[PDB]
């Protein structure tokens, strides 16, 4: 008896309005390792940031266009870096072990 299930049933890991304090805290409190989300960089040079939790260790990454239009993530130098046209490609690729990621991108929370 009753039918109540609204739409907009999405977490959305992309927030240009969260900040590292509440982003890293979102991962640490909600918790389930392989936790990731893409936040606003605090100015820097017009970049994006990716905060990832794994076993009491939050590593926060930057994600820069650079000086063209392509979104590169610096995991390491010797590691072959990939430039993405969308944040979706970023999340999908780094969901796989690369060499540099603390655990790879398992789930937002």
UniProtKB/Swiss-Prot annotation:
**What happens to this protein after translation, modification-wise?**
Tyrosine phosphorylated by the members of the SRC family after exposure to a diverse array of extracellular stimuli such as insulin, growth factors such as EGF or PDGF, chemokines, integrin ligands and hypertonic and oxidative stress. May be phosphorylated upon IgG receptor FCGR2B-binding.
Induction, as annotated = By bacterial lipopolysaccharides (LPS).
How would you summarize the oligomeric state and partners of this protein? Interacts with tyrosine phosphorylated form of SHC1. Interacts with EGFR. Upon stimulation by the EGF signaling pathway, it forms a complex with SHC1 and EGFR. Interacts with cytoskeletal protein SORBS3/vinexin, promoting its localization to the periphery of cells. Forms a complex with filamin (FLNA or FLNB), actin, GPIb (GP1BA or GP1BB) that regulates cortical and submembraneous actin. Interacts with c-Met/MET, when c-Met/MET is phosphorylated on 'Tyr-1356'. Interacts with p130Cas/BCAR1. Interacts with CENTD3/ARAP3 via its SAM domain. Interacts with c-Cbl/CBL and CAP/SORBS1.
Per its database record, what is this protein's job? Phosphatidylinositol (PtdIns) phosphatase that specifically hydrolyzes the 5-phosphate of phosphatidylinositol-3,4,5-trisphosphate (PtdIns(3,4,5)P3) to produce PtdIns(3,4)P2, thereby negatively regulating the PI3K (phosphoinositide 3-kinase) pathways. Required for correct mitotic spindle orientation and therefore progression of mitosis. Plays a central role in regulation of PI3K-dependent insulin signaling, although the precise molecular mechanisms and signaling pathways remain unclear.
* Domain SH2 positions: 13-109
Recorded consequence of changing residue 39 to G:
Abolishes interaction with p130Cas/BCAR1 and its ability to induce increased adhesion. Abolishes phosphorylation upon FCGR2A clustering
Signal peptide positions on this chain: none
Q: In which organism is this protein found?
A: Homo sapiens (Human)
- Other noteworthy facts: Its ability to confer resistance to dietary obesity suggests that it may serve as a possible therapeutic target in cases of type 2 diabetes and obesity.
Cellular location(s): Cytoplasm, Cytosol; Cytoplasm, Cytoskeleton; Membrane; Cell projection, Filopodium
Tell me the domain of life.
Answer: Eukaryota
Q: According to the UniProt entry, which disease involves this protein?
A: Genetic variations in INPPL1 may be a cause of susceptibility to metabolic syndrome. Metabolic syndrome is characterized by diabetes, insulin resistance, hypertension, and hypertriglyceridemia is absent. Opsismodysplasia: A rare skeletal dysplasia involving delayed bone maturation. Clinical signs observed at birth include short limbs, small hands and feet, relative macrocephaly with a large anterior fontanel, and characteristic craniofacial abnormalities including a prominent brow, depressed nasal bridge, a small anteverted nose, and a relatively long philtrum. Death secondary to respiratory failure during the first few years of life has been reported, but there can be long-term survival.
| Tissue localization of expression | Widely expressed, most prominently in skeletal muscle, heart and brain. Present in platelets. Expressed in transformed myeloid cells and in primary macrophages, but not in peripheral blood monocytes.
Can you list the disulfide-bonded cysteine pairs? none
The record's similarity note reads:
Belongs to the inositol 1,4,5-trisphosphate 5-phosphatase family.
Q: What is known of its domains?
A: The SH2 domain interacts with tyrosine phosphorylated forms of proteins such as SHC1 or FCGR2A. It also mediates the interaction with p130Cas/BCAR1.
Name of the protein: Phosphatidylinositol 3,4,5-trisphosphate 5-phosphatase 2
